């Protein structure tokens, strides 16, 4: 399983995105939710009352039975327009999030894999070294046996052997971790990963501080992030300033009211004043409203609209230097990257040369199995720490992408290229 | 009025059939077909899987290492059959970014009950069983999960 | 003062759980708010209000006194009745916030006491090379008083010295701070903790993973919290689809009010229409109310809850895999720590069989002292490793517990039967 | 540039304090927005509505348009000073958090400047031990070349020259990341800085820590912001509490309104109950409101404040216990950097006399030049390591003071006294 | 109505007598007394301190090294009796799980004041006084709170 | 009715002649004088940078390196001059704590738009133009903003 086919399962089993996904939705929701109320609203409603008189309206009962049916629709009112482009505003930002999300999912992705490849040369590299202490307190073993040395060097050569041990175990639960790691992230467990191919990676050299700024001007998701907060805050700001205009609406109803009367006083000379009333009623109506001087209210609103404002260009700016920060570190990652490469490539052919003159003087007759037991030692150690700045290298260069806002699975066809040889992951499998 | 655009693109790539849809419906259906037969083959439950349980279990049947849990009941807590099953209420699922759902299922034996959980997944335009976390007490054999039990 | 007398006392003196019961405890408290909309609701009001008519009824004047008790109470309305088991819910996971503070708390504390006896263990470490190295700088001067050695080898000697004594100063302050933040966890000075006992401790393999696995899927709390969060999802969703339903209210009025016209017009030919009234009122009625398309409104309220179900939903998931990836962890950890213990173990024999070594040699005659110091400060740092990985150990004890959700006073009851010998933690008691 | 002069430019424009203090100001204005419901409101409304009658007031339509403008006042409600109060306490904190904010602000540019000043000096003592492990490679080089030693010996030379050729490289961008983190904190790129005076800079004891504790019980902003928020939740329990008491307020109006009626049961012999009306009121009058039991309502939320202050408490007491542990802390830390100041100018004093013995050896004839070599790069590791140590020492100088609650530019320009001599700091000219 | 059940279930071992109750009562009716006798002995403060502020100046007094301190005054910031005293109010306190309560005590002497700070706790089943921090310039001796000062 | 305090003391050290005021209207200024006048000198812009725009500007034409930058424009995305220019909205500023304030600037030229970016700063009591960051498609020359272009 090469990392594009990693990255595939992990784009749809990833229960962090989804999570970024639905909020997008509301958001976007929101806004149908935020335009409801420009639409017009309609209810119906019922009322029956009963009323009994008491002291000078004594002995007098009344029973009403209304049923009404309103619809008020707004004229002019400008914040609910306003809110609605909140609204808007507030999906955008959401949306730019949803893509920081995105991005950073690449990211873990990719670091956990080759995490999970460092672990496995890491417990090779301490397989070979336990081989070798073994091999060398067996020759300590020996030595007394005859008797050549003390018992003091039997007790250390067995302290460096069990101190051995504990570094295997402590590598290979580190190697568990890792794929553990890489399930979570994937929610699927990968027996057999891809391994590095020496002869196709090729180190290449950036192209211009200069230019990665100027791209991450104007490509960097955090930058328009703020960007689209300080619009906010505009307007937010006009919002408040909204407050001092008048507002208009209509309103119509349709009325069935039935009224009767009772009681002693009823019962008198009151004629055509005290009859049961059958009313109908359509009533349409336009209403205007414009409030004044209301304290400070308005005005202190619009104060607090535009200290936010302040807020907001002065975190803008913030963004924006931290934006530099990362793209002028990130540039100089690579290169410190490139640097310890080449020296880890020269101290891998030195050891080697040592490894091959141990090798030769053991076969002509002037060494011993464990010379070359310690020499094969070193030479994988100096494997492990190059194969470790290669994947470091790896890892730096997605950095720069995705610090300049441009990361994508183009970055991750461009590394796979370079993954050839599967390679198991099985502790017992890669070290029995 | 507008609508709403999902975020994914794809969420596909299904092999096996797959039920007409609903999580909590495809929950209940799963149910019923268990409680109406009384054989609990995996052959035959071949669309309620999407395609690594039914490979999974495939397997674990050929090695023959779990055949005690596999005869009893792989998808149930009791090694008996529940008698009755009622999942939550869900009340549908808008758009298609909607994976790894999960649902206490509340089954309800003679007197008793254990209230086991399900995970619903998509892959493709349809709803599949997944997990069965086992939620109750002294449950049947292995631990965990369904596929902690089962994986290697 | 064991581990049980120190616990018991921070569960009393402790300002970060006390904080959480009072949160819990607010949270239970606002079911009665929650559930008092419920209840009937009266109230009373008095009004005074003198009126003064203008164009055509020029010089009416009007002056009306009102007293009204007005009571009312619901019939039928899901709404309140969706927001108490809302709040019943956030009780609940307020509890379960509570229960993983006292989890973290015994957790903190047991690593505190750890920390102190680890300090103390260092310190008696650096004493015993503090000594050793000024008995070395005694040995170099004293052959360059005779003359045998370069003043190099002087200065290199004073520098080892002073760094000795720097490191000696710092020991002394990490002991401090140790016992400082023991205080400040549980509000009292200590002046003599437990030891460790060698005969009493043990190490025991724990349970297979599995077993682990299964436990912890139906004890951890952070699993209990995501799924009561979801349940509470459910319940939103729910209420937010009650909005479709209609409501219904009673209510009841007792008004008395006393009315008064006069000013010019009234005192007219009018004769009975314009005279004082003394209104008595006992109205009493119900008032149906079933909304209406109000534009989206409910449509998109229903689709947030929906969006927010599901963001719950991937929450649950994310947690189950953490807790099965924490679990996993914890459970390799412990056997890294037995490992880590044997190697300790055997490095510690080692240095003892040197030292016993060394003692010999210079009883016969063929060793200084400088060597025997040497070997005895070897064997304090091995000693001293070997107490911190036992205390590694039952930090990862206590650690798995925690992740199987299943931690109190018990697991340190257990804890408890290995502490014996008390010792002091005075930093001028052990290092004078 | 020194110190002063880097503050007093970082203090204008460091966009970081802008919005702390652009809060301030939002939470100062919002007292006039609290205050603006107590003030008198005053309202105008105009509403033109149209009936239309049926059934029995069949045949009867009105036009009626009615212009009203309302002036309302209220007398007796404890509500709205309650609410001054909070949000003048709300201020108070918010100015209490300012305080802070400018402290820290302090702290992280002095901690800039220092981090720029040792990255310099690794530069140094890396350059020159790339210089000496050059000279030590072509010295194998030509030992190789005439023939003493075997390949494997060259190649580990060369092995360590890519080594160091890493080291310088990361460095390098060491150096250039401690200056843009400068140029990012004060907005403006510092071409050269002024480095430490070694006779001027002069370790002093601290004053005893009993008197520290005892300024900064009284002068610590994190208590005074804590002691601030439990008198916030002691005027939430009373603004809780005042649900009590009743309200009181007076009203009036002016409305004019005029009614037409028309429509065929009006186009009779009506007379005198169908005329055209041109009515004005002037309405005044007041009201006054008490209510009584609604349920659980006010006890409930009193009972909530209660918890909240409680919670309050808890959050005082462990405020000034982390205190208590922060001000023991930072004493202890004082203590050991001036141990190990003494142990680093010894050290130094060593290696210059090591130095100054193989450099007369070279002279007299018993040495070679890498000899001397390695010998200024031993000096030079030494004196980097105590230029550390002595901004570690002033950086604790000036964390005691942050942690005891008095920071300002005093203290800054008291450090400036040592900062004398200049230094570039650009990579080429410190290194080309 | 409901109720809510106390998370904690022992909040107890107190030694000494206690008397009634009530932080600002409690706290009132101590500075009462100290106005009221001019005595300040501890011999009979016991009742007010909680369990070990009696026993800590008992033993500080049998050291014979803090005379200055415990001659004077060893309860507030000023060497001398205050004139009137007013401590902040809290009303009241639910159920039983509250300790470690702060408040801020106003001390008036002739036209002064320094607004010293004081502790309370539960210690059982009542409410007793505890540290006083001091909180005031011109502070009598030593540093700190009391506790700090006599501590070793 | 209460006003605030401001939180800065000072915030001054202006060498230069100031306009009157308004950082939206400065702006605007600005680029009413780009359009009227068809030299973009920096003799004639004086008032308009701060303190080190107008120093660094004199230095890149001294040094002669950036001669083909300051030729085209030194102020725009593009070589040539925009035909219109509206910015963005900014309702005032309270009191004097507000510095980088940064502004998006439409510029309209023939059926085209780049909508640069720009900041605002105080030094001083008044508003002054800096950085101009380029933002927009097809970019002038060098790369970043133009301080970051014209910096050693």
């Not at chain 1, 979570?184 to 467990?189: D, F, K």
């Not at chain 2, 092999?15 to 083959?41: K, M, T, W």
Request: charged share 20%; proline share 3%.
């Amino acid at each position: 399983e090469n990392l594009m086919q990693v990255y595939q399962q992990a784009r749809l089993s990833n229960p962090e995105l989804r999570k970024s996904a639905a909020d997008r939705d509301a958001a976007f929701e929101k806004i149908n939710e935020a335009r409801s109320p420009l639409l017009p609203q309609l209810g119906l409603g019922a009322d029956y009352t009963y009323s009994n008189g008491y002291r000078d309206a004594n002995g007098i009962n009344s029973n009403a039975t209304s049923a009404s049916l309103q619809l008020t629709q707004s004229i002019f009112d400008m914040s609910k327009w306003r809110a609605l482009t909140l609204q808007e505003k507030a999906a955008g930002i959401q949306d730019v999030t949803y893509q920081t999300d995105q991005q950073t999912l690449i990211l873990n992705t990719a670091t956990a894999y080759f995490n999970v490849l460092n672990a496995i040369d890491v417990l090779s590299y301490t397989q070979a070294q336990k081989e070798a202490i073994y091999r060398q307190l067996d020759q300590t073993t020996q030595r007394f046996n005859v008797g050549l040395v003390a018992i003091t060097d039997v007790q250390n050569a067995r302290a460096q052997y069990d101190t051995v041990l504990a570094n295997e175990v402590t590598a290979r639960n580190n190697l568990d971790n890792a794929v553990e790691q890489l399930r979570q992230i994937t929610g699927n467990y990968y027996p057999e990963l891809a391994a590095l191919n020496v002869e196709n990676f090729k180190t290449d050299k950036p192209q211009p501080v200069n230019a990665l700024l100027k791209e991450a001007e104007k490509r960097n998701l955090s930058l328009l992030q703020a960007r689209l907060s300080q619009d906010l805050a505009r307007e937010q700001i006009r919002q408040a300033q909204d407050g001092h205009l008048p507002t208009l609406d209509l309103t119509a109803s349709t009325g069935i009211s039935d009224t009767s009367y009772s009681g002693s006083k009823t019962r008198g000379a009151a004629g055509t004043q005290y009859d049961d009333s059958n009313m109908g009623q359509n009533k349409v109506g336009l209403s205007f409203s414009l409030p004044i001087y209301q304290g400070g209210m308005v005005n202190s609103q619009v104060k607090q609209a535009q200290y936010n404002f302040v807020g907001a260009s002065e975190q803008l700016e913030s963004a924006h230097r931290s934006v530099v920060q990362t793209v002028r570190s990130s540039f100089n990652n690579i290169n410190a990257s490139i640097s310890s490469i080449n020296a880890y490539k020269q101290a891998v052919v030195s050891a080697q040369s040592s490894l091959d003159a141990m090798e030769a003087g053991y076969s002509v007759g002037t060494r011993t199995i464990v010379d070359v037991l310690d020499a094969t030692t070193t030479l994988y150690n100096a494997k492990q720490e190059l194969a470790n700045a290669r994947y470091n290298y790896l890892i730096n260069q997605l950095n720069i992408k995705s610090a300049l806002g441009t990361l994508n699975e183009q970055d991750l066809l461009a590394l796979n290229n370079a993954l050839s040889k599967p390679v198991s992951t099985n502790p017992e499998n890669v070290a029995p | 009025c507008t609508t709403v655009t999902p975020a994914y693109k794809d969420n596909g790539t299904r092999s096996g059939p797959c039920v007409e849809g609903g999580p909590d419906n495809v929950a209940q259906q799963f149910y019923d077909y268990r409680i109406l037969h009384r054989s609990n083959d995996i052959t035959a439950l071949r669309p309620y899987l999407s395609d690594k349980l039914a490979t999974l279990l495939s397997d674990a049947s050929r090695d023959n290492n779990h055949r005690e849990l596999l005869t009893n009941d792989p998808f149930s807590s009791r090694t008996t059959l529940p008698d009755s099953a009622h999942v939550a209420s869900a009340s549908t699922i808008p758009n298609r970014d909607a994976r790894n759902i999960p649902l206490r299922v509340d089954l309800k034996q003679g007197d008793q009950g254990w209230q086991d959980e399900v995970l619903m997944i998509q892959e493709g335009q349809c709803w599949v069983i997944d997990d069965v976390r086992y939620l109750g007490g002294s449950v049947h054999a292995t631990a965990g999960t369904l596929r902690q039990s089962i994986e290697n």
